[PDB]
Symmetry: D2
Subunit: 290 residues, 4 copies
C-alpha cells in the first residue's frame, strides 16, 4: 500500500564541503559503499518499489550508482571477477525502480519534496532524508514498522528519538503528551522546526523518516516561506494537524547524522565494526593506533 519513497538529494555540499566539492555528499564513502545505498536499502527492506530522487544538475553519480555501467561490467569479466560483478549489478532488486526529478533552486526540503508531487500523484508515500543513516538489528527495521502502523491507523507517521535538551535548536521537535515506548506511536498535537533551547515542546526530535498522505503536496503549495526564508516540510505537517491526525513513532534503533563531518566519522566507526567481512580485522586496527 505504501510503495513510493522521496529522497531529497538536491542540497550542495556546505555542511560537508571539502569532500563534497566535486562529488555529491550523498555519494561519500562509508567504509566501502556510498551513504545513499544505506538509505535506499533501508527503504527497500520496507517494501519500497519506487525510489524518487529529488536531485540537482550535479548529482549524476547518484543516478548512475543504481544503474548498469557497461565499461565496468566488461572490465569485471576480462578480469574473471564475477564476485563484484554481482554486487555492482544487483545494488537493488529488479522489481525496484529509481526515478529522477530536478529541484530548479535550493528553496529547502519542503520545495524539494513538492518537486516529487507529479510522481507521487495520489499514493501515500514515505520520505527519507539521506543525510541520516539508521542502523537497526533483530527482525524488521523502524521504517517497516511506521508504514504498517500508517496502514492500520490512516494517520501520518513521523519518526522521533529523544535528544539532549541543548541540541534541540538543531532538529525539528514534536509537541506530545507523554513520549511513546520504543517501537510504538503516540498521537502528537504540534511540531516546530527551529525551537530555541528551553523553548522546546519536548525533547523528542524529528529523525528524518516520514509517512505522509498526498494531501501534504497541496499543503506544501500553500505553506508560508518561513524558517530561514526556505519552505519547510515540518510547517506543512502542522497544516495537516489542523484537519487530519498525525502520530509520532519512536524508533528502536540508533541513528547517525552524515550531515556533520563528525557524525559521518561516527557512522564509519559503527558500520565499520558491524561490517561482516572486515568488522573484526578493523577492530584490531583501532587497538593498535596509540
Amino acid at each position: 500500500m505504501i510503495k513510493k519513497a522521496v529522497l531529497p538529494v538536491a542540497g550542495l555540499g556546505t555542511r560537508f564541503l571539502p569532500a563534497s566539492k566535486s562529488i555529491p555528499k550523498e555519494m561519500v564513502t562509508v567504509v566501502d559503499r556510498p551513504a545513499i545505498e544505506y538509505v535506499v536499502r533501508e527503504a527497500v527492506e520496507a517494501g519500497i518499489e519506487q525510489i524518487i530522487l529529488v536531485t540537482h544538475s550535479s548529482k549524476a553519480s547518484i543516478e548512475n550508482y543504481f544503474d548498469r555501467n557497461f565499461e565496468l561490467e566488461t572490465t569485471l569479466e576480462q578480469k574473471k571477477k564475477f564476485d563484484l560483478l554481482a554486487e555492482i549489478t544487483q545494488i537493488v532488486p529488479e522489481h525496484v525502480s529509481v526515478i529522477s526529478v530536478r529541484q530548479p533552486q535550493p528553496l529547502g526540503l519542503g520545495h524539494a519534496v513538492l518537486c516529487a508531487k507529479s510522481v507521487v500523484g495520489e499514493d501515500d508515500f514515505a520520505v527519507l532524508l539521506p543525510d541520516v543513516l539508521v542502523k537497526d538489528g533483530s527482525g524488521q527495521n523502524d521504517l517497516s514498522r511506521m508504514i504498517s502502523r500508517y496502514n492500520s491507523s490512516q494517520a501520518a507517521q513521523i519518526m522521533v528519538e529523544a535528544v539532549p535538551d541543548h541540541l534541540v535548536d538543531q532538529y525539528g521537535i514534536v509537541d506530545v503528551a507523554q513520549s511513546p515506548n520504543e517501537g510504538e506511536s503516540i498521537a502528537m498535537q504540534g511540531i516546530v522546526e527551529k525551537p530555541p533551547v528551553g523553548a522546546a515542546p519536548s525533547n523528542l526530535s524529528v529523525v528524518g523518516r516520514y509517512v505522509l498522505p498526498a494531501k501534504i503536496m497541496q499543503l506544501l503549495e500553500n505553506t508560508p516561506k518561513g524558517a530561514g526564508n526556505e519552505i519547510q516540510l515540518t510547517d506543512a505537517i502542522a497544516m495537516l494537524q489542523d484537519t487530519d491526525t498525525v502520530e509520532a513513532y519512536r524508533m528502536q534503533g540508533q541513528t547517525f547524522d552524515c550531515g556533520s563531518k563528525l557524525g559521518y566519522l561516527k557512522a564509519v566507526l559503527h558500520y565499520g565494526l558491524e561490517h561482516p567481512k572486515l568488522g573484526m580485522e578493523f577492530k584490531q586496527l583501532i587497538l593498535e593506533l596509540k
Copy 2:
C-alpha cells in the same frame, strides 16, 4: 484526461554517429535549439504535464536542458541580456515536470517504454519517439486530436502517414480496410514491424506518435523475445488488438526523421525557413549558392 507522455531517449546514436559520439542524438542542434525541445514543445501544446524521459547514463544534457543552469543564468544577468534569460528559464511552463528513468540495457523501444511502467501507473499515456519531429499548421496540433479522440473512443490511437511502397522495409505498417482521411482515425485489424517491401497490409507507416492504456505495460512484460534483435512495441500492440480496440489516426501534419542524417538536414531546411526571426534571411542565404 491523458497527461503523461513517455520519450524513449535511451538509445546510443549509431545512425547519426560522428555527431552523436559525445552528446545525445536528441541534443543535435536543428536550427538553434536541440531536436528534443521540438518534441517536448509538441507534447506540452497537447496538455502533457509530465515528460517521462527513458534515458541512458550519457544523456545528462537532455535532463539538464529542461532544468535551471545557475552559472549561465548569472552570466546572462551580469551581462544585461534579459532577452535570452526568459527563453532559457521558461523552456517549458512551470506546471510541466520532467521525470527521468534508466533503461539498464538497450533491449529495444518496447523495453524502454516498459521502463516507465511505475511512473505511468494506471493512467492512459502518450508515447513520442523523439528521433521524429511533426511540423503542423493552423488550429491545434496532431497529437492534440489523437488524445481528444482516445478519450471519447476509449480505444488506443496510433499515428499513421502514407509512405512509398518500397520504404515499407524501414517502418512499422498497419492493417486497415479503407485508408483514413487526414485528421480522422479508422479502426485497424493488424500491425507488422519490419514487413519486407511488397508484403505489407498497406502503405500506412506508424509515424511514432501513440496514445496507449496502462494495460500495454503488462503486455510488454510478456511480449515475444523480439521482432528483430530485441522486444518491439508494435508486437505489444498486436496483443492489444486480441482484446481491446486499436484505431489508426492519419495525421494532417508533415513529419521529419532526425534519425537518418539526411532526414535531419531536410528538417534543418524546413524549420529554418519557418523561423520567425532568421526565416527570410535564410531564404536569401540559400538563393546565393552555386
Copy 3:
C-alpha cells in the same frame, strides 16, 4: 617548427543559445559532426600535433569526442559496422596529443591563452578561436601558409579579411600600408580591439587565427584589462609590435562565425553541399 595549437574553449555560448545551453557551443552539430572537429582538422592538416584545450567545468564533451568511447566502439566492433566505427575511432591521427587545462575564471582571450603558458613553455605556437571555422582552399589550407611564413619571416602572423565598415565595430582591426593581397602577408603598424564604427584604421578584421612567439606569454602577463575589463590578445600583439615586426596574413579561404545564428546556418549550407556522401542528395532537398 610550429607544433602546438591553443584553442580557447572556456567561454559559455551566450551568443548561441538555447543551442549551447546543455552542450558546449563547440559541439554544435554542423551537417553531421561537431564544429570543433573542423577547427582541429584545420590544425592537424597544417602539421599541428598538440591541440591544447583551455576549457571549463562544463565542456567534458570536447575531451570525450577526441578519445575512445568504449561502449560505442565495442557495440560497433561486434555488429561489424566498420563504416561508422571509422567515423569515431580515428578522428585525429594517433601521433596527435589533446591536452586540457581549465581557465579558472573567464577574464578574457588573453588570460585564456596565458593559461596554456606552462604547456607551451618556450615553443612558438598557433591560436585557433573555435567559434570561427575557415573553409579549406585550393590544396594548401590558410593556416599552413601562415606557419611556413612565420617559419621564414620569424614574424608573428595574424589572419585578417575585409568586413563592411559598419560591422568593424566588433572585431580587432589592424593598420596597414599597402593593403595585403589574397594569400599574402604584409607588415603592420598597430592593432586595436572592438574600435568605434568610423575612426578604425582599416576594414581588415582579426579573423581568429594567429601564429605567435612564446614571448607573447610575458606580454600577456603584463597586458591589463582592455575591453569589458577583459584581458585582450590584441593588446599583447600591440606590445609585441613595439619591439619585433608583426605581419597581417590575408585569407585565401572562406570563413564562418558559428557565434552568429546566421553564420552557423551558412556553414551548414556550404559544408552541406561540399559533404562527401550527403552533398549530392542534399543539393536535391534544397531544390524542393
Copy 4:
C-alpha cells in the same frame, strides 16, 4: 629543478568497489576530503608546480576538484561563510598548473606515463601513484628528500619499503646491494614486477613514488608487455639500469593502499586522529566504542 609530476588515474577502481562504482577511486573521501588531494598536496610541498593527470572519460570530478566551482563559491560568499570558502578555493597554490591528457586504452602503468610524453617534454619528472598515500610526519616529506637526492646524484630515484616475505608478489621489488637505511638511497642492480613468492631479490617493494629522467619516455616507447598484457614501468626502469645508475630510496614516512579496503580504513583512522578540527573529538569517539 624537478617541477612536473605525472599522476596516472586512468584505472577504474575494481580493487575498491562499490566505493568507486560511480566516483573515481581518487575521490574516495578520507576523513573529510578526496584521496587525490593528499597525493597532490604531497607533490606541491616538494616544489611540484605542473601536476599532470593521465586520466579517463569517467574521471571529470578530479579536474573539477582542482578548479573553481561557480555555484558553490557564490553561494558561500552569500552566507559570508569564509571558513568553507577557504576549503574549496586555493586547495593548491595559485602558481600550480593542472594538466589533463587521456589514456585511450588501459595498456598499463608504463603506457600510462608514456601518454604524458608531449607535456613532460625533455624535463626530468616525478610519478605519484594516487592509490598509495604517504604520510610524512618527519617535517620534510619523503618526496622532497627524494627530489633533492636525484638533483644531487642525478640518479633515477625509486621509493621502497619492507613488506612481509609473503605478499611480495603484489608489488615490484628491487635488487639492493648493501640494504639501504631509513630515509636514504643505495644503488640497485635490477628490479622485477610482481615476482613469485619465492623468486624475490628482497622484501623491498616499489611503493608508488618515483623520480625519473625523460630518457624513460624513449625506453617506454620500446618495452614490450610485462606482467599481463600490460607495459610495466618497472620493466622500463630495468632498461635504464642497463646504462645509468638507478638508486632505491627507502621510506622514512608511513604509507596506505586505498587500493585495499583496510589500507583505506587505516588512512581514515590515522589522518583522522591527526585532523586539526576533528582529531580531538574523533579520538573521543574511538574511546566511546564499548
